[PDB]
């Protein structure tokens, strides 16, 4: 089917390039992610400085590329501590330009426990087709 093929070039052409974490009060980066966040066979990780647990101002930025055009782009983000929910974010971008690189930032307003147990999962959809799924494990310091 032509829809399948289309729904296939859309997947192939999408790439999450990087994620980062800032102290929203100062505007300073606390941690930016290299790092084939798209690659498989790898549990993506963030080694963030513990200060992050002290600010009230945290902003998380994403940067993504799309070779293909899409009409109903949206994302779903959830931060989990084990089974418990810390944050759940949603955003409808709608239209995404062909061969384009886009950014999305939101402002989010004890240790031995948190480290290695915090996961951020970003799910990306075109209308209702899943295009990409990321997972990043948090290690405080």
């Amino acid at each position: 089917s032509a829809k399948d093929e289309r729904a296939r070039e859309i997947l192939r052409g999408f790439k999450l390039n990087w994620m980062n974490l800032r102290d929203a009060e100062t505007g300073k980066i606390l941690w930016q992610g290299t790092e084939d966040l798209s690659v498989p066979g790898v549990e993506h990780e963030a080694r963030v400085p513990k200060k992050i647990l002290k600010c009230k101002a945290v902003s998380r930025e994403l940067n993504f590329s799309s070779t293909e055009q899409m009409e109903k782009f949206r994302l779903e983000q959830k931060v989990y501590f084990k089974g418990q929910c810390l944050e759940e974010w949603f955003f409808e971008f709608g239209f995404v330009i062909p061969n384009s690189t886009n950014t999305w930032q939101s402002l989010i307003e004890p240790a031995s426990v948190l480290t290695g147990n915090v996961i951020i999962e970003t799910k990306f959809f075109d209308d209702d087709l899943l295009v990409s799924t990321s997972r990043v494990r948090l290690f405080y310091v």
């Binding site: 009060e25 330009i97 384009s100 950014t103 999305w104 930032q105 939101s106």
Partner: protein, 165 residues
Amino acid sequence: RELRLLMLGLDNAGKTTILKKFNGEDVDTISPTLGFNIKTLEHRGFKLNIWDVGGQKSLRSYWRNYFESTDGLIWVVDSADRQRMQDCQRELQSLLVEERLAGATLLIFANKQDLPGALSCNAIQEALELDSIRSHHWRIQGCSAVTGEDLLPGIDWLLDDISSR
């Protein structure tokens, strides 16, 4: 209600530097936007979504796919770019008959005021025929994304105007 702000202008105008400086982030390593840069935050109790869209010839034609449900449009000008000042005028007037932007509030940032050969606001006011604009509420404001001069005075007004209607 969350407010949707839409930031446009010609490439190299200062859009992205303005959006970053406004959030207290560095502006020393900014590069051409090859898509859109969206920023979700809180200012003076307002829950905002600020869309900064690339202004190169190639990107411009996709501008209208973001018109829907826009509360305020920020038109950004390179005050020292007398060369494209008329192409700037055209783009803007063209934006003023768009039906999905009707009743949006217009804010004009006369950017790059920190530059030697920068036209005043009057000159830019005149250059873009703003006095002829009755379709929308507007206000021009000169500023400098680099020094951070007079950015809040513009956003604060815009925020208050949209809220009053």
